[PDB]
Amino acid sequence: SGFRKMAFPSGKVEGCMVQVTCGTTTLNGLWLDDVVYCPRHVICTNPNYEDLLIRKSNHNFLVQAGNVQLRVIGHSMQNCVLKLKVDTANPKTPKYKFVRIQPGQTFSVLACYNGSPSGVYQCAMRPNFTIKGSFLNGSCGSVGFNIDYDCVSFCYMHHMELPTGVHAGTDLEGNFYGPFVDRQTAQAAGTDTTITVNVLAWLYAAVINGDRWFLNRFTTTLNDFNLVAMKYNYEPLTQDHVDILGPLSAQTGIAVLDMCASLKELLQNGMNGRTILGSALLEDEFTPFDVVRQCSGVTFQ
Amino acid sequence: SGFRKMAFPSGKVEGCMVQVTCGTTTLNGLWLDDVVYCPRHVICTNPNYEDLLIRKSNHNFLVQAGNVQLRVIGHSMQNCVLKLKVDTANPKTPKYKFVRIQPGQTFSVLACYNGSPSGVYQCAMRPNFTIKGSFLNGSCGSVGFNIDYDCVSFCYMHHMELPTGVHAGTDLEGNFYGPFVDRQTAQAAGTDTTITVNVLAWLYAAVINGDRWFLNRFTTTLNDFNLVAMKYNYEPLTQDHVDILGPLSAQTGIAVLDMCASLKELLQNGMNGRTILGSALLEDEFTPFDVVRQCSGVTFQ
Numbered sequence: 001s002g003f004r005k006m007a008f009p010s011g012k013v014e015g016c017m018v019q020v021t022c023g024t025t026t027l028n029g030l031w032l033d034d035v036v037y038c039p040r041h042v043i044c045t046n047p048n049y050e051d052l053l054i055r056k057s058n059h060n061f062l063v064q065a066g067n068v069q070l071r072v073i074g075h076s077m078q079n080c081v082l083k084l085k086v087d088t089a090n091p092k093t094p095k096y097k098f099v100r101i102q103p104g105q106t107f108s109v110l111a112c113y114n115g116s117p118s119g120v121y122q123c124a125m126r127p128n129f130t131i132k133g134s135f136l137n138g139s140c141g142s143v144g145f146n147i148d149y150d151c152v153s154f155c156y157m158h159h160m161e162l163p164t165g166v167h168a169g170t171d172l173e174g175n176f177y178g179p180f181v182d183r184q185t186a187q188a189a190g191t192d193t194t195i196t197v198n199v200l201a202w203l204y205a206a207v208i209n210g211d212r213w214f215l216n217r218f219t220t221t222l223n224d225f226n227l228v229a230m231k232y233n234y235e236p237l238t239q240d241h242v243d244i245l246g247p248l249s250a251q252t253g254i255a256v257l258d259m260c261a262s263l264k265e266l267l268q269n270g271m272n273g274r275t276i277l278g279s280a281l282l283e284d285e286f287t288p289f290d291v292v293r294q295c296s297g298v299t300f301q
Numbered sequence: 302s303g304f305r306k307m308a309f310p311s312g313k314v315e316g317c318m319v320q321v322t323c324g325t326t327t328l329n330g331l332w333l334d335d336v337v338y339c340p341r342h343v344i345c346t347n348p349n350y351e352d353l354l355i356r357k358s359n360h361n362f363l364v365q366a367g368n369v370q371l372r373v374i375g376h377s378m379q380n381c382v383l384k385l386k387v388d389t390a391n392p393k394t395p396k397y398k399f400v401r402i403q404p405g406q407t408f409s410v411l412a413c414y415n416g417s418p419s420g421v422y423q424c425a426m427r428p429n430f431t432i433k434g435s436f437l438n439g440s441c442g443s444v445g446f447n448i449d450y451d452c453v454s455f456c457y458m459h460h461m462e463l464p465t466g467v468h469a470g471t472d473l474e475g476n477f478y479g480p481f482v483d484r485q486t487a488q489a490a491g492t493d494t495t496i497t498v499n500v501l502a503w504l505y506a507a508v509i510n511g512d513r514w515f516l517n518r519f520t521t522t523l524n525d526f527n528l529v530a531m532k533y534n535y536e537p538l539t540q541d542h543v544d545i546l547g548p549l550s551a552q553t554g555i556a557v558l559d560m561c562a563s564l565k566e567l568l569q570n571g572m573n574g575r576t577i578l579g580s581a582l583l584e585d586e587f588t589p590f591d592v593v594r595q596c597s598g599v600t601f602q
Contacts, residue, residue, distance in 0.1 A: 001466040004435035006420035009411060011312025066602075110310060116600040118420055119307035130578065134305035136598045163513065210466065267496040278433065280581035297437045300415040301367075 002267075003205050003277045005285070007108040008147040008295055015092030018113030019064035019083065020141065028141030029063065029084070030154070030172070031094050036063055036070070036084040037142045037172060039159050040077055041182045047065060047138040053077055068102070079174025080182050081157060087284075096152040098172035103127040104195040106233070106287050107144040107155050114199060117286040124198070124285040126166070126236060128190045129178025133158070133167040143172070147292040147300040162189050195284040196234045200259050202283045205291040206250040206276045215254065215273055220263040225260040230268045245286045251295075304506050305551055305580045307595055308423040309448040316393030320365035320416030321385065321442065325355070329442030330364065330385070330411040331447040332472070333394050337364055337371070337385040338473060339442045340460050341378055342483045349499040354378055365416060380475025381483050382458060399455040399473035403538070403573070404428040407588050408445040408456050412436060424585040425499070426457075427467070427533075428536060429491045430479025434459070434468040444473070449599070463490050496585040497535045498542040501560050502566040503584045506592040507543040507577045516555065519562040526561040533568045545589045552596075 010181050014054050020029035020038045023045075029038035043052045044060070053075070061084055063070035074085030101107060106124045108115050111134065123131050123144075135158060137144070144156030159169040159182050168180040180187050203214065242256045249256045263282070271280060292298075321330035324346075330339035343362070344353045354376070364371035364383055375386030390472045404409060407425045411418050412435065424432050434457060436443070444459030460470040460483050469481040481488050504515065527537050540565050541567075543557045550557045564583070572581060594597075 001438075001462060002433060002468065004420075004422040004424070004433075005306055006412070006422045006435060007308060009312070009418040009421055010310045011315040011418075014310050014312040060317055063438065079490075111307070113598055113600045116602040117310040117416040118598075119305075119595070120310055120602040121305040121307045123305070132303060132305075134303040134307060136596070161302060192512065240471050275582065278582075281576065281579075292523055294420070294429075294435055295437070297419075297439065299414045299419040301417040 001209055003209055003294060005122045006257050006290075007120045008300065010108065010110045010120045011129060012094040012147065012152050013110045013143065013145055014117045015088060015094070017110065017112050017115050017117055018070065020261045021062040022060045023062070027138065028115050030071075030087065030141070030143050030157070031065060031086070031090045032096060034086055034089045036072075036086055037156060037157070038082050038084065039182065040080050040082045040174070041140070041159070041172075041211070047084060047183055049077060077174075079173065080159065081174035081178060086190060094152045094293065095150050096154060099153045099155050100171040100175070101125050101155040104198060104287065105218045106285060106290055107146050109133060109144045109156070110142060111139050113138040114143045122285070124195065125177060125190075127195065128192045128230050129180070130162060130166040130168055130189045130192070131156070135161060135167055149300055162187065163265050164189055194232070194282070196229055196237045196263075197288065198284040198286055199234075199243065200237075200245055200246060200256070200263060201288040201291045202277065202286045203259055203263065204245070204254070205295060206254055206288060207252045207254060208291075209277060211276055214266055214276060215258075216262050216265055218265070219255070219258050219263055220261040222257065223266060224261070225257070228264050228267060234267070248288060248291060283286045302510055304510055304595060305392075306423045307591075308421045309601065310445065311409065311411045311418065311421045313395040313448065313453050314411045314444065314446055315392060315418045317394070318411065318413050318416050318418055322363040322365070323361045324410040325484055326490070327415060328439065330393045330445050331396060331417050331442070332366060332371075332387070335387055335390045337387055338458070339383050339385065340458060340483065341381050341475070342441070342460070343383060348484055350378060354551065366499055378569060380473075381471050381477060382473065382475035390424065395453045396451050397455060400454045400456050401476070402426050404559050405588065407501060407586060407591055408443045408447050410434060410457070410459070411443060412440050413443045416438040423586070425496065426478060427490075427493050428496065430481070431463060431469055431492045431493070432529045434472070436462060436468055450453055450601055465490055476479065487569070489499065495533070495535045495583070496590040497530055497533040497538045497564075498589065499558070499585040500535075500583045501538075501564060502549060502592045503578065503587045504560055504564065505546070505555070506547040506587060506596060508555060509592075511570045512577055515563045515567055515577060517558075517563050517566055519566070520556070520559050521562040521565055523558065523561070526558070526565060528538045529565050529568060549589060551593060573598060
């Protein structure tokens, strides 16, 4: 019992974190097999990165894997990330994949400085394709990921802080999440929404953990919910959402539409000083999978 | 910028997590050098563990380090943990220490099942020597820890869930945190309090992150604060607390006693629908060190 913002064990990823330096720019790189991935704004000197990259040679890239120099024997650009071919395959290379996540999906971040892992936290991709992360100067290149049995699914590389303090970055093929670019523009996060399906998964987590207050006798149709949801800046709840909550509905015997009625009342009346799962806010950064994982027993390795 | 419940990178500890089986009991063990540490309630069959342990032989203990059997060549009891001498030193043994933490101090938990690491989360030792953790059956033996440069300071081994769903365990010498025992009694958590020094450190974290609302013109003496603190079930604030908040007072230029006056008003008026650092509650599970670490840049490896 208990419920915690849990992150995946980070060792498999720590073994891949390196330091990439070229010029006066130092950031973090991801070393898989004989490639080191890192953000392309490490390239020297309003940019045009194809120009700047042809301007460069391998020996410009200093790659530090712990105490060991790493010799760059080739480079290339893949959208907003640099692929730096090195002469050594990372012996600690886990089985891995590059996958792109949907808004509302969660992942773990291994925040890094100078290729040294600093901390690990769990977060979600906001519906506006930002993440509310914790990053300081030099965290560029830190990656986000999930673990499934033994496989590391890399989904995120960190590029920049947006003026509101939220964070933007790319998948591991270099394609940004959201309408953001790796150059200095006036770019801002669009207005965010609350991930309704996640809040419902969290409420089930509260019920599983004995917090049964918020529940009620009422029920509601999906349409009538979404009419109230939209009013409170909540994502629409789809039939697929309802199906994905099914197993949690089963395990607790509270029908999905019943839980929506509780959410409806929670939105309309607030919480009146009570709390759910140690929180005075409705939490939207736990998916249905996260709840099941943290309430059934599933491990990884 | 941003602020997250961050946990230490867990790889150094994952390399030490093993599986310990004897009888029909399976739990997690900690493999450092040629010792495997684990809770003693793994011993077979109202207990008297000295009796039960002399009843046993090495070959009763099945120790699984991944795919590799581990041969137990000796055992012994150290308070509530079992030390199982094995014939192989853990090649992945990090530099480490066994340290005992004070209530109010935080640590990372690597929740494990069957020696396989499941997740990592940050938590604090409650003033009543419980932790609000996230554990399922089989998490016994999961360890808590901090990392300081390269050194893993093991501070916690998980033993049991208390009737309120909070968690109790020992340091790595087997001495419990709080008045709890590893036998079936009516034991319960005593009434908890809020870790005042931590809430103040968190408020500084909010100020550092632009959340400047809660602040005010007022001030307060330490005595007058504690008179209001005690009323709201908050730990007393000591002069040493005030000194430890010093650097954060400096960095933000809000005197410690001024921040206490804001806390005083927050306790007296509540938050009026606003939030601090994404929370509608005053958070007491970040120490002054945690805030500085997550707002200055400090790494580990």
